[PDB]
């Protein structure tokens, strides 16, 4: 069935129409960004604000003795 898979089609032609439009808050309106900023900030919370985009450096350290 391809009235069915016309509609798999029909959405998939807007797989391509939107995907080759752009997609995001695009073909779609601002809405996405207005969350997006906050939701990706939550990801910043999900890692802590330890910059998930700077290569980390590492501890050089000593425990105690006498």
């Amino acid at each position: 069935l391809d009235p069915v898979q016309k509609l798999f089609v029909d959405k998939i032609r807007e797989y391509r129409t939107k995907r080759q439009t752009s997609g995001g808050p695009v073909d779609a309106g601002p809405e996405y960004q207005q969350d997006l900023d906050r939701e990706l900030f939550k990801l910043k919370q999900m890692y802590g604000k330890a910059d998930m985009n700077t290569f980390p450096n590492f501890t050089f350290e000593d425990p105690k003795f006498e």
């Binding site: 290569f55 590492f58 050089f60 350290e61 000593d62 003795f65 006498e66």
Partner: protein
């Protein structure tokens, strides 16, 4: 993937120093109470053991 690769090259390249420590004076805090063992009772004891065990024979007679 510039980030990945940046960190990838960095990780591939990334080689830690090793830790800090400081009580390798314990090596020598040993040698002091390493001569205490020696001097004090190394020598004392041989000396003392000599006269005594020797001191067994003659008074065993």
């Amino acid at each position: 993937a510039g980030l990945v690769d940046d960190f990838e090259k960095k990780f591939n390249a990334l080689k830690v120093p090793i830790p800090e420590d400081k009580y390798t004076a314990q090596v020598d805090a040993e040698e002091k109470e390493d001569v205490k063992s020696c001097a004090e009772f190394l020598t004392q004891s041989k000396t003392r053991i000599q006269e005594y065990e020797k001191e067994l024979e003659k008074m065993r007679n």
